[PDB]
Coordinates of all heavy atoms in Angstrom, one line a residue:
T9 N 0.8 -1.3 0.0 CA 0.0 0.0 0.0 C 0.8 1.2 0.0 O 0.6 2.3 -0.8 CB -1.0 0.1 1.2 OG1 -1.5 -1.2 1.6 CG2 -2.2 0.9 1.0
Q10 N 1.9 1.3 0.8 CA 2.7 2.5 0.9 C 3.7 2.6 -0.5 O 4.1 3.6 -0.8 CB 3.8 2.3 2.1 CG 4.8 1.3 2.1 CD 6.1 1.6 1.5 OE1 6.5 2.8 1.3 NE2 6.9 0.5 1.1
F11 N 3.9 1.5 -1.1 CA 4.5 1.5 -2.4 C 3.3 2.1 -3.4 O 2.2 2.2 -3.2 CB 4.9 0.1 -2.9 CG 6.3 0.0 -3.4 CD1 7.4 0.0 -2.5 CD2 6.7 0.0 -4.8 CE1 8.8 0.0 -2.8 CE2 8.0 -0.1 -5.2 CZ 9.0 0.0 -4.2
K12 N 3.8 2.3 -4.7 CA 2.9 2.9 -5.8 C 1.8 1.9 -6.1 O 0.7 2.4 -6.3 CB 3.7 3.3 -7.0 CG 2.9 4.2 -7.9 CD 3.7 4.2 -9.4 CE 2.7 4.9 -10.3 NZ 3.2 4.8 -11.8
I13 N 2.1 0.7 -6.1 CA 1.1 -0.4 -6.5 C -0.2 -0.2 -5.7 O -0.3 0.1 -4.4 CB 1.7 -1.9 -6.2 CG1 0.9 -2.9 -6.8 CG2 1.9 -2.1 -4.8 CD1 -0.2 -3.7 -6.0
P14 N -1.4 -0.2 -6.4 CA -2.7 0.4 -6.1 C -3.4 -0.3 -4.9 O -3.2 -1.4 -4.5 CB -3.4 0.6 -7.3 CG -2.9 -0.6 -8.1 CD -1.7 -1.0 -7.7
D15 N -4.6 0.6 -4.6 CA -5.5 0.0 -3.5 C -6.3 -1.1 -3.8 O -6.3 -2.2 -3.1 CB -6.2 1.2 -2.9 CG -7.0 1.0 -1.7 OD1 -6.4 0.6 -0.7 OD2 -8.2 1.3 -1.7
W16 N -7.4 -0.9 -4.8 CA -8.4 -2.0 -5.1 C -7.8 -3.4 -5.4 O -8.4 -4.5 -5.1 CB -9.2 -1.5 -6.5 CG -8.3 -1.0 -7.5 CD1 -8.1 0.3 -7.9 CD2 -7.4 -1.8 -8.6 NE1 -7.1 0.4 -9.0 CE2 -6.8 -0.8 -9.4 CE3 -7.3 -3.1 -8.7 CZ2 -5.9 -1.1 -10.5 CZ3 -6.4 -3.4 -9.8 CH2 -5.7 -2.5 -10.7
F17 N -6.5 -3.4 -5.9 CA -5.7 -4.6 -6.3 C -5.6 -5.7 -5.1 O -5.7 -6.8 -5.1 CB -4.4 -4.2 -6.7 CG -3.6 -5.2 -7.6 CD1 -3.3 -4.7 -8.9 CD2 -3.3 -6.5 -7.3 CE1 -2.8 -5.6 -9.9 CE2 -2.7 -7.3 -8.1 CZ -2.4 -6.9 -9.3
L18 N -5.4 -5.0 -3.8 CA -4.7 -5.7 -2.7 C -5.7 -7.0 -2.2 O -6.9 -6.8 -1.9 CB -4.4 -4.7 -1.6 CG -3.4 -3.6 -1.9 CD1 -3.3 -2.7 -0.7 CD2 -2.1 -4.2 -2.5
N19 N -5.0 -8.0 -2.1 CA -5.5 -9.2 -1.4 C -5.9 -9.0 -0.1 O -5.2 -8.4 0.7 CB -4.4 -10.4 -1.6 CG -4.9 -11.8 -1.2 OD1 -4.1 -12.7 -1.0 ND2 -6.1 -11.9 -0.9
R20 N -7.1 -9.4 0.3 CA -7.8 -9.0 1.6 C -8.1 -7.4 1.7 O -7.2 -6.8 1.9 CB -7.0 -9.5 2.8 CG -7.0 -11.1 2.9 CD -7.6 -11.6 4.2 NE -8.9 -10.8 4.7 CZ -9.4 -10.9 5.9 NH1 -9.0 -11.7 6.8 NH2 -10.4 -10.1 6.1
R21 N -9.3 -7.2 1.4 CA -9.6 -5.7 1.1 C -9.5 -4.9 2.3 O -8.4 -4.1 2.4 CB -11.0 -5.6 0.3 CG -11.2 -6.2 -1.1 CD -11.8 -7.6 -1.0 NE -12.4 -8.0 -2.2 CZ -13.6 -8.7 -2.4 NH1 -14.2 -9.1 -1.2 NH2 -14.1 -9.0 -3.5
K22 N -10.5 -4.9 3.2 CA -10.5 -4.0 4.4 C -9.8 -4.7 5.7 O -9.6 -4.0 6.7 CB -11.8 -3.6 4.7 CG -12.7 -2.9 3.6 CD -11.9 -1.9 2.7 CE -11.5 -0.6 3.5 NZ -12.7 0.1 4.0
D23 N -9.5 -5.9 5.6 CA -8.9 -6.8 6.7 C -9.7 -6.9 8.0 O -9.1 -7.3 9.1 CB -7.4 -6.0 7.1 CG -6.4 -6.2 5.9 OD1 -6.8 -5.7 4.7 OD2 -5.3 -6.7 6.1
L24 N -11.0 -6.7 7.9 CA -11.9 -6.9 9.0 C -11.7 -6.1 10.3 O -12.5 -5.3 10.7 CB -12.2 -8.4 9.3 CG -13.1 -9.2 8.4 CD1 -13.1 -10.7 8.8 CD2 -14.5 -8.7 8.6
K25 N -10.5 -6.5 10.9 CA -9.9 -5.5 12.0 C -9.9 -4.1 11.4 O -9.0 -3.8 10.5 CB -8.6 -6.1 12.3 CG -7.7 -5.4 13.5 CD -7.3 -4.0 13.4 CE -6.2 -3.9 12.1 NZ -5.0 -4.7 12.4
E26 N -10.8 -3.4 11.8 CA -11.1 -1.9 11.1 C -9.8 -1.1 11.1 O -9.6 -0.3 11.9 CB -12.2 -1.3 11.8 CG -13.6 -2.0 11.5 CD -14.5 -2.2 12.7 OE1 -14.6 -1.3 13.6 OE2 -15.0 -3.3 12.9
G27 N -9.2 -1.2 10.0 CA -8.0 -0.4 9.6 C -7.5 -0.5 8.2 O -8.3 -0.3 7.3
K28 N -6.3 -1.0 7.9 CA -5.6 -0.9 6.7 C -6.0 -2.0 5.7 O -6.6 -2.9 6.0 CB -4.1 -0.8 6.9 CG -3.6 0.2 7.8 CD -3.8 1.7 7.1 CE -3.2 2.8 8.0 NZ -3.4 4.1 7.3
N29 N -5.5 -1.8 4.4 CA -5.6 -2.7 3.4 C -4.4 -3.1 2.8 O -3.5 -2.4 2.4 CB -6.3 -2.0 2.1 CG -7.5 -1.1 2.5 OD1 -8.2 -1.3 3.6 ND2 -7.8 0.0 1.7
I30 N -4.0 -4.4 3.2 CA -2.8 -5.0 2.7 C -2.9 -6.6 2.4 O -3.6 -7.3 2.8 CB -1.8 -5.0 3.9 CG1 -2.3 -5.4 5.3 CG2 -1.0 -3.6 4.1 CD1 -3.1 -4.4 6.2
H31 N -1.9 -6.8 1.4 CA -1.8 -8.3 0.8 C -1.2 -9.0 2.0 O -0.2 -8.5 2.6 CB -0.8 -8.2 -0.3 CG -1.1 -9.3 -1.3 ND1 -0.9 -10.6 -1.1 CD2 -1.5 -9.3 -2.6 CE1 -1.2 -11.5 -2.0 NE2 -1.4 -10.6 -3.1
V32 N -1.6 -10.3 2.2 CA -1.4 -10.9 3.4 C -0.4 -12.1 3.2 O 0.5 -12.2 4.2 CB -2.8 -11.6 3.9 CG1 -3.5 -12.5 3.0 CG2 -2.5 -12.2 5.3
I33 N -0.2 -12.6 2.1 CA 0.9 -13.5 1.7 C 1.2 -14.8 2.5 O 1.3 -14.7 3.8 CB 2.3 -12.7 1.6 CG1 2.2 -11.4 0.7 CG2 3.5 -13.5 1.2 CD1 2.0 -11.8 -0.8
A34 N 1.6 -15.8 1.9 CA 2.1 -17.0 2.5 C 1.3 -17.8 3.6 O 0.0 -17.9 3.5 CB 3.6 -16.7 3.0
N35 N 1.9 -18.3 4.6 CA 1.1 -19.0 5.7 C 0.2 -17.9 6.6 O -0.8 -18.3 7.2 CB 2.1 -19.6 6.8 CG 2.8 -20.7 6.1 OD1 2.9 -20.9 4.9 ND2 3.6 -21.5 6.9
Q36 N 0.7 -16.7 6.6 CA -0.1 -15.6 7.2 C -1.5 -15.5 6.7 O -2.4 -15.4 7.4 CB 0.7 -14.2 6.9 CG 2.1 -14.2 7.7 CD 3.1 -13.6 6.9 OE1 4.3 -14.1 6.7 NE2 2.8 -12.3 6.3
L37 N -1.6 -15.7 5.3 CA -2.9 -15.6 4.7 C -3.8 -16.8 5.2 O -5.0 -16.4 5.6 CB -2.6 -15.9 3.2 CG -3.8 -16.1 2.1 CD1 -3.6 -15.4 0.8 CD2 -4.0 -17.7 1.9
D38 N -3.2 -17.9 5.3 CA -3.9 -19.1 5.9 C -4.5 -18.8 7.3 O -5.6 -19.2 7.6 CB -2.9 -20.3 5.8 CG -3.7 -21.7 5.8 OD1 -4.9 -21.7 6.2 OD2 -3.1 -22.7 5.3
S39 N -3.5 -18.3 8.0 CA -3.8 -18.0 9.4 C -5.0 -17.0 9.6 O -5.9 -17.3 10.3 CB -2.5 -17.4 10.2 OG -2.6 -17.5 11.6
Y40 N -4.9 -16.0 8.7 CA -6.0 -15.0 8.6 C -7.4 -15.7 8.3 O -8.4 -15.3 9.1 CB -5.6 -13.8 7.7 CG -5.1 -12.6 8.4 CD1 -3.8 -12.6 9.0 CD2 -5.9 -11.4 8.6 CE1 -3.3 -11.6 9.6 CE2 -5.2 -10.3 9.2 CZ -4.1 -10.4 9.8 OH -3.5 -9.4 10.4
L41 N -7.3 -16.6 7.4 CA -8.4 -17.3 6.9 C -9.1 -18.1 8.1 O -10.3 -18.1 8.3 CB -8.1 -18.3 5.7 CG -9.0 -19.4 5.3 CD1 -9.0 -19.6 3.8 CD2 -8.7 -20.7 6.0
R42 N -8.2 -18.7 8.7 CA -8.6 -19.6 10.0 C -9.3 -18.7 11.0 O -10.3 -19.1 11.5 CB -7.3 -20.2 10.5 CG -7.7 -21.3 11.6 CD -6.3 -21.6 12.3 NE -6.5 -22.6 13.5 CZ -7.0 -22.1 14.7 NH1 -7.3 -20.8 14.9 NH2 -7.1 -23.0 15.6
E43 N -8.7 -17.6 11.3 CA -9.2 -16.5 12.2 C -10.6 -16.2 11.9 O -11.5 -16.1 12.7 CB -8.1 -15.3 12.5 CG -8.6 -14.1 11.9 CD -7.4 -13.0 11.9 OE1 -6.6 -13.2 12.7 OE2 -7.4 -12.1 11.2
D44 N -10.8 -15.9 10.6 CA -12.1 -15.5 10.0 C -13.1 -16.5 10.3 O -14.2 -16.1 10.7 CB -12.0 -15.1 8.6 CG -11.3 -13.7 8.2 OD1 -10.6 -13.2 9.1 OD2 -11.8 -13.2 7.2
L45 N -12.7 -17.8 10.0 CA -13.5 -18.8 10.1 C -14.1 -19.0 11.6 O -15.2 -19.3 11.8 CB -13.0 -20.2 9.6 CG -12.7 -20.3 8.1 CD1 -11.6 -21.5 7.7 CD2 -14.0 -20.5 7.4
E46 N -13.1 -18.8 12.4 CA -13.3 -19.0 13.9 C -14.3 -17.9 14.3 O -15.3 -18.1 15.0 CB -12.0 -18.8 14.8 CG -10.9 -19.8 14.5 CD -11.5 -21.2 14.0 OE1 -12.2 -21.8 14.8 OE2 -11.0 -21.6 12.9
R47 N -14.1 -16.7 13.8 CA -15.0 -15.6 14.1 C -16.4 -15.8 13.7 O -17.3 -15.5 14.4 CB -14.5 -14.3 13.3 CG -14.3 -13.0 14.2 CD -12.8 -13.0 14.6 NE -11.9 -12.5 13.5 CZ -11.8 -11.4 13.0 NH1 -12.6 -10.4 13.5 NH2 -10.9 -11.3 12.0
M48 N -16.5 -16.4 12.5 CA -17.8 -16.7 11.9 C -18.5 -17.7 12.7 O -19.7 -17.5 13.0 CB -17.6 -17.4 10.4 CG -17.0 -16.5 9.4 SD -17.2 -14.7 9.5 CE -18.9 -14.5 9.4
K49 N -17.7 -18.7 13.2 CA -18.2 -19.9 14.1 C -18.8 -19.2 15.3 O -19.9 -19.6 15.8 CB -17.2 -20.9 14.3 CG -17.7 -22.1 15.1 CD -18.5 -23.0 14.3 CE -20.1 -22.8 14.5 NZ -20.6 -23.4 15.9
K50 N -18.1 -18.3 15.9 CA -18.4 -17.6 17.1 C -19.7 -16.9 17.0 O -20.6 -17.0 17.9 CB -17.3 -16.7 17.6 CG -17.3 -16.3 19.0 CD -16.7 -14.9 19.4 CE -15.2 -14.9 19.3 NZ -14.5 -15.3 20.5
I51 N -19.8 -16.2 15.9 CA -21.0 -15.4 15.5 C -22.2 -16.4 15.5 O -23.3 -16.0 16.1 CB -20.9 -14.5 14.3 CG1 -19.8 -13.4 14.5 CG2 -22.2 -14.0 13.8 CD1 -19.3 -12.9 13.2

């Protein structure tokens, strides 16, 4: 995001945790997904 490469592009748009927009990458992505799933379950 801080680089020139644009906003709409970025993998994982708003990041749920109400803040920034960033590409998540590698095992981190997986972890994020897992977290999301957990959240959903909780809900």
Side-chain angles (χ1 to χ4, degrees):
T9 323
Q10 70 89 14
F11 233 80
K12 196 196 171 188
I13 196 270
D15 188 54
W16 47 260
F17 212 113
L18 301 177
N19 187 189
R20 288 242 40 189
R21 296 97 155 215
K22 312 309 296 296
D23 299 53
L24 279 171
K25 190 286 301 298
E26 287 135 44
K28 302 295 188 181
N29 314 335
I30 45 270
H31 208 298
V32 61
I33 306 290
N35 302 4
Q36 295 137 231
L37 170 138
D38 205 339
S39 202
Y40 263 73
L41 161 146
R42 191 190 170 284
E43 110 192 337
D44 278 28
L45 290 164
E46 298 334 298
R47 234 94 70 77
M48 300 333 294
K49 188 68 263 284
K50 199 208 288 276
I51 292 161

